[PDB]
Scaffold this active site. Structure first.
Site, PDB file in Angstrom:
ATOM      1  N   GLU A 174     -19.200 -20.934  -1.177  1.00  0.00           N
ATOM      2  CA  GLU A 174     -18.673 -21.330  -2.450  1.00  0.00           C
ATOM      3  C   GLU A 174     -19.547 -20.728  -3.518  1.00  0.00           C
ATOM      4  OE1 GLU A 174     -19.524 -25.661  -0.950  1.00  0.00           O
ATOM      5  OE2 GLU A 174     -19.591 -25.699  -3.179  1.00  0.00           O
TER       6      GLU A 174
ATOM      7  N   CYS B  59     -17.713 -27.337   1.214  1.00  0.00           N
ATOM      8  CA  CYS B  59     -18.630 -27.321   2.353  1.00  0.00           C
ATOM      9  C   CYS B  59     -17.982 -27.258   3.719  1.00  0.00           C
ATOM     10  CB  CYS B  59     -19.593 -28.497   2.260  1.00  0.00           C
ATOM     11  SG  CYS B  59     -20.449 -28.521   0.690  1.00  0.00           S
TER      12      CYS B  59
ATOM     13  N   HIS C  60     -22.277 -32.976   8.226  1.00  0.00           N
ATOM     14  CA  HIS C  60     -22.534 -32.311   6.960  1.00  0.00           C
ATOM     15  C   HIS C  60     -23.601 -33.136   6.289  1.00  0.00           C
ATOM     16  CE1 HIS C  60     -22.371 -30.343   3.162  1.00  0.00           C
ATOM     17  NE2 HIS C  60     -21.987 -31.446   2.548  1.00  0.00           N
TER      18      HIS C  60
END
Lengths: 402, 407
Positions: free
Chosen positions: B81, B113, B237
């Site tokens: 990103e 993400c 994550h």
């Protein structure tokens, strides 16, 4: 074991368009298979285009078939955010099931083919038997010799296990890529770089992709193997040129028979590109779709497809389309939808151009006027269409209009 | 045919700073930091970018391959990103400086993400499709944070490169054992070139919603799966350790439905290993889960093959829960990369040096057309460590980037 490819495909070629030659005058003898270019209105964006491309496909599916859509990849170089994929919004307004991977792929005009090939592998992987995927290539041109040529459009492609419209030949793939200094998009609302090497690289890739395809598909032949051929087509003229070059370079046939080969194998694929302009990552799919609507499939025919994106990456691949496939494709009435679009005058075009600023990559807050060009909305009377209503703290709100 | 990670390596920056030090120097409320398990954050120098980070992550993997093995790399997906162009993929430059064969698909994927996992799952399907038997893929998650206030100390820079193929000793995936879930949500996004905006107000709620729903989908496809017994470790994550500790707790109550008293033990034995490398680097966005996976494999115990469950989330949003096996041989392979050692060898910035960097980060800023970089702009850094050659950004010339190897 298991087949894979396109079960359905549809084109959204804009709400509005202008006449390419008229726009050149208002701004000599280039005249290069261009006739019309589609133009995104300010109340339109790559979500709008993508959703409107895909809606007729989803409408025609049962509730159960739709819930098997488990991968939604949107392919674009007209991104609206550095992290949020266009696929999030599209997923919402198409009403897909939450049990679905979603994301955006980007490599210039190769984006679509990259998305499609990943979707094909999802199917062939059988990691989710019976699943489908939806790949949506969507690009727009906002803002000298590029303006009359540069279009806006989207093509949605439903991929799955019964691909009557384009069953791919598994493994029959020649992909080729390497870094090249080329026209890119390094600035929010514009382009830069140099189309000086563009053609050379497109032709290099075109040749090398086929040679890689031959290497993996012994007996393949550029003339006999493919009953039609589809190419990334920014404008018809350069594809006509590139086909010629391929027939001399690769097929090595006599100059006199080339024009015939072009007319019978390539010209059908070029019909829709003249109505819409260069739609970037969707251009090859558009040409594929043109090929299938405008060609002849009394019996199953093999089509060869060449994809290219600046920067660069490229791929050549092939598939079979059947009489049933072409029938399915006709129900979408792509040509009819192109015929129904609103033709801008140059004055209207100027109002649009000056208005395109209010929706510009950084835009945080804006309310759109659907009557900013008075005639357009209440002009045609067709199925509901999605438009951008507002941006509120960077979040986009869309509305259906009947 | 099997599929997954054959090798994996982390590049955690050239330079880093102490997170608490940076909070003080910025005059922030120290309390809002104290239980979050943060220690260090990596910082991209102005002569570094996502290509630099990606290439430096992947170089050791490529170095260890034979010429023939490398030429089977036929798919290069980079996950970010932190894009540098709206159309030109980071994969083009990365492909060049790693010296890969031209017979290779290349592109960039983007979903906050989730990018890494999305890339990795597409790569896995390339292998399982057997459209090119014996082929490998290379998936590189690469993100950096350039410059709201409370994000600065937390926001990192890093890349993780993942070689995927048919003999995955380091993480063999369980084919079809996948629970993906996504839907549109108004969340913190990246709608402006060099910054963020939106609201982390719903972020946690969505992360937890997704964390639950992905596992329930996984159970639906993997009958008998169980959140406690099926997985010997779990990776998430992880923007910072604190919220993953919180999210594990919530999962054990919500999903596993176990008694409160045993949760801390479960976190320490199954989740804490995965959190080691995050503390050294900060939130590295699309690479964060892979970082935690790599941390898990280096810091855990694999006397015998263990199953690891991985949860991927990206704002906006999309998410997936998936699993794989890693073997003693896998952990051995991973040790040869010396990830921890590489993290130990980075240069620690002082706040004065950090200010020079911050004021310098502007010269490399999304629209930048022409710039020449000074590798001595923070005098000590280059000739500091003595390691394998490393890639840096030398110049941008008419938007085209030129990179240089430095020994």
């Amino acid at each position: 074991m298991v087949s894979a490819g396109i079960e359905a495909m549809n084109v959204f070629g804009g709400t509005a368009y202008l006449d390419v030659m008229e726009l050149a005058k208002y701004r000599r003898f280039e005249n290069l298979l261009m006739k019309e270019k589609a133009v995104a209105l300010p109340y339109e964006d790559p979500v709008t285009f993508g959703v409107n491309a895909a809606k007729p496909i989803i409408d025609a599916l049962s509730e159960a078939e739709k819930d098997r859509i488990e991968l939604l990849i949107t392919c674009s170089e007209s991104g609206i955010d550095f992290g949020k994929s266009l696929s999030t919004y599209i997923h919402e307004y198409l009403g897909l099931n939450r049990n679905c991977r979603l994301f955006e792929v980007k490599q210039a005009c190769y984006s679509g083919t990259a998305g499609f090939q990943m979707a094909v592998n999802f199917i062939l992987s059988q990691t989710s038997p019976g699943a489908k995927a939806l790949v949506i290539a969507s690009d727009i041109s906002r803002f000298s010799y590029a303006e009359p040529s540069a279009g806006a459009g989207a093509v949605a492609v439903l991929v799955g296990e019964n691909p009557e419209v384009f069953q791919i030949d598994p493994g029959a793939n020649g992909y080729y890529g390497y870094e090249v200094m080329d026209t890119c998009r390094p600035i929010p609302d514009s382009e830069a770089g140099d189309s000086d090497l563009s053609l050379m690289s497109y032709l290099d890739c075109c040749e090398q992709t086929f040679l890689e395809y031959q290497k993996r598909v012994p007996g393949a032949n550029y003339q006999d193997t493919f009953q039609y051929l589809a190419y990334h087509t920014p404008f018809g003229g350069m594809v006509k040129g590139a086909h010629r070059t391929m027939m001399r370079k690769v097929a090595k046939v006599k100059t006199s028979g080339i024009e015939t080969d072009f007319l019978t194998r390539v010209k059908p694929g070029l019909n829709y590109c003249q109505r819409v302009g260069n739609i970037m990552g969707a251009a090859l799919f558009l040409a594929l779709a043109s090929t299938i609507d405008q060609g002849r499939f009394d019996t199953p025919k093999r089509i060869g497809c060449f994809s290219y994106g600046s920067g660069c990456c490229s791929e050549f691949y092939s598939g079979i389309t059947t009489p049933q496939g072409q029938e399915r494709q006709r129900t979408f009435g792509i040509e009819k939808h192109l015929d129904r679009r609103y033709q801008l005058s140059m004055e209207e075009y100027e109002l649009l151009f000056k208005g395109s600023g209010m929706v510009r990559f950084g835009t945080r807050n804006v309310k759109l006027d659907f009557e900013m060009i008075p005639g357009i909305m209440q002009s045609t009377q067709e199925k509901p269409r999605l438009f951008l209503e507002e941006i509120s703290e960077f979040h986009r709100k869309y509305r259906w209009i009947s």
